[PDB]
Design a protein around this ligand. Structure first.
Ligand SMILES: [Zn+2]
Ligand SMILES: [Zn+2]
Lengths: 74, 32, 151, 267
């Protein structure tokens, strides 16, 4: 089948609650979000976080192709 | 390779121009 | 005005009578080991009493400085709420947990998200999708190789 | 003390009664001495097994016949001294108050962590060493949580795949370190450790460096923090998904500890 999603309707200020997540990464919001302004360390934090992860990936690539060529000899 | 990966978002923000269009762009990237 | 037993360590001893709360503490049962015969001169506000008169028993300013405190330390963000209760916590003896001793306006809440979190989530999910399709392609290739070898 | 034929005061229900010590029993020799000469228990003579492992006395209640004669241990027997006589008077007054209450009532009548068994065992053995024994952890506490969290990151991040998940890993490491520092003085302390913490803070002010409990303390107080974490988190208002993230990071940190418990938890 399929799945549908509709954004929540706007609610007046007396009955609308805007809440800030404690979890930053992977917080399953319903797609209904609000963007807050972003307030130098964070810029370099992103740079190393991609380095490490991509490195791990290479390693994940290199750990499985060796098992593939070692299967063909058997 | 790495530099373009880390520099993609704010160069996209610079290309967007208006902050409302960038807000809707981040909404698109969140909905994905 | 006083308690017969220490509400922190749970045995009787030398006490310090607080002004408002009737609970009393030993000279070591405090965040700082108050030096006996050297206790600062004053009313002796405890941590609870200092937390109440710091916020002036009003909710709005306390939520605003709680949000300001969370805004300061976004590196420890998931624990930032847990750092606050500590301030309003009277240090006590470590009593074991019970399992250790053995052997509607909230439905339409709008999430306040930031640009960096959206960036992290988008990168995380594209990397997840790309490598799950890559690894499933590798697994199907290995399975087809095994099928052609066995046949 | 206790002597053959001497006065003693003994329990009998809730009250104190005077008695003569006719026999003195020694559990090690399976023997008792009597008054008109060591001897063992006779054919019809026996002692209840609840007290027979402790030093028993066969006693005779004053003002009551020999059918009330019985063996009592140190729990049920005390020496005849003024403290015991005074608390005998006190319990006589309690019986008097009970009788007065009897009179009053009759005259009114006329009118989500599931940790395995090894962490539980090491935590309860630390509990036994810290409560039933004076022994506490070493000063520098050897391997600090610095080390644990640091390597734990250096292994899990090289096992973790997404940059997003590594952000949560570093975020959880930093938050756990800062919470350890800011909560060790609040809950993570026992007896004979408050003095150690006082010594630590007076030593820190001598060399002008500010105090810090991450490096100073060992990794076992960190596990104590993880143990108190489930009850501590649910005390205040906290999310669903943030709670699940916290217990998930809790569980995989705990199983990473379970890989090499013997590195940090060997006596
Ligand atoms: Zn105390
Ligand atoms: Zn107080």
């Amino acid at each position: 089948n399929y799945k549908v999603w509709k954004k929540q309707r706007l609610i007046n200020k007396k009955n609308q609650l805007y809440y800030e997540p404690l979890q930053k990464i992977g917080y399953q919001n319903n797609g209904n979000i609000q963007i807050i302004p972003t307030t130098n360390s964070i810029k370099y934090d992103f740079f190393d976080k991609i380095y490490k992860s991509k490195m791990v990936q290479k390693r994940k690539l290199f750990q499985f192709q060796e098992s593939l060529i070692d299967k063909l000899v058997s | 390779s790495l530099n373009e990966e880390v520099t993609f978002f704010e160069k996209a923000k610079r290309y967007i121009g208006n902050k409302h269009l960038y807000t809707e762009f981040l909404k698109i990237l969140n909905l994905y | 005005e006083n308690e017969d037993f220490c509400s922190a360590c749970n045995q009787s001893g030398s006490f310090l009578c607080c002004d408002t709360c009737p609970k009393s503490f030993h000279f070591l049962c405090l965040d700082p080991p108050i030096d006996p015969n050297n206790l600062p001169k004053g009313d002796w506000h405890c941590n609870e009493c200092k937390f109440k008169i710091f916020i002036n028993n009003s909710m709005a300013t306390l939520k605003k400085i709680e949000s300001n405190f969370i805004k300061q330390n976004n590196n420890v963000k998931i624990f930032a709420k847990l750092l606050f209760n500590i301030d309003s916590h009277n240090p006590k003896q470590f009593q074991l947990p019970n399992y250790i001793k053995e052997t509607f306006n909230q439905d339409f809440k709008i999430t306040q998200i930031d640009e960096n979190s959206i960036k992290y989530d988008f990168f995380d999910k594209i990397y997840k999708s790309k490598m799950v399709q890559k690894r499933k392609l590798f697994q199907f290739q290995e399975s087809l190789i095994d099928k052609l070898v066995s046949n | 003390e206790f002597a053959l034929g001497g006065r003693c005061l003994a329990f009998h229900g809730p009250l104190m009664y005077e008695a003569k010590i006719l026999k003195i029993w020694d559990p090690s020799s399976k023997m008792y001495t009597s008054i008109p000469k060591p001897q063992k228990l006779g054919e019809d003579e026996s002692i209840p097994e609840e007290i027979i492992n402790g030093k028993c006395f066969f006693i005779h209640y004053q003002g009551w016949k020999s059918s009330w004669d019985e063996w009592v241990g140190y729990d049920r027997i005390r020496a005849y001294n003024e403290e015991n006589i005074a608390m005998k008077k006190r319990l006589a007054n309690e019986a008097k108050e009970a009788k007065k209450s009897l009179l009053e009532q009759q005259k009114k009548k006329k009118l989500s962590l599931q940790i395995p068994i090894k962490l539980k065992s090491v935590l309860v053995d630390d509990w036994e060493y810290v409560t039933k024994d004076k022994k506490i952890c070493r000063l520098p506490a050897d391997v600090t949580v610095e080390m644990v969290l640091n390597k734990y990151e250096h292994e899990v991040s090289q096992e973790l795949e997404s940059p997003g998940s590594q952000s949560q890993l570093s975020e959880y490491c930093a938050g756990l370190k800062l919470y350890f520092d800011k909560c060790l003085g609040n809950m993570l302390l026992y007896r004979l450790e408050r003095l150690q913490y006082d010594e630590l803070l007076k030593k820190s002010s001598k060399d002008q460096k500010p105090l810090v409990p991450i490096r100073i303390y060992g990794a076992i107080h960190l596990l104590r923090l993880i143990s108190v974490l489930p009850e501590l988190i649910s005390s205040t208002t906290m999310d669903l998904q943030s709670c699940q993230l916290l217990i998930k990071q809790t569980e995989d940190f705990l199983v990473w500890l379970l890989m090499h418990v013997d590195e940090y938890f060997n006596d």
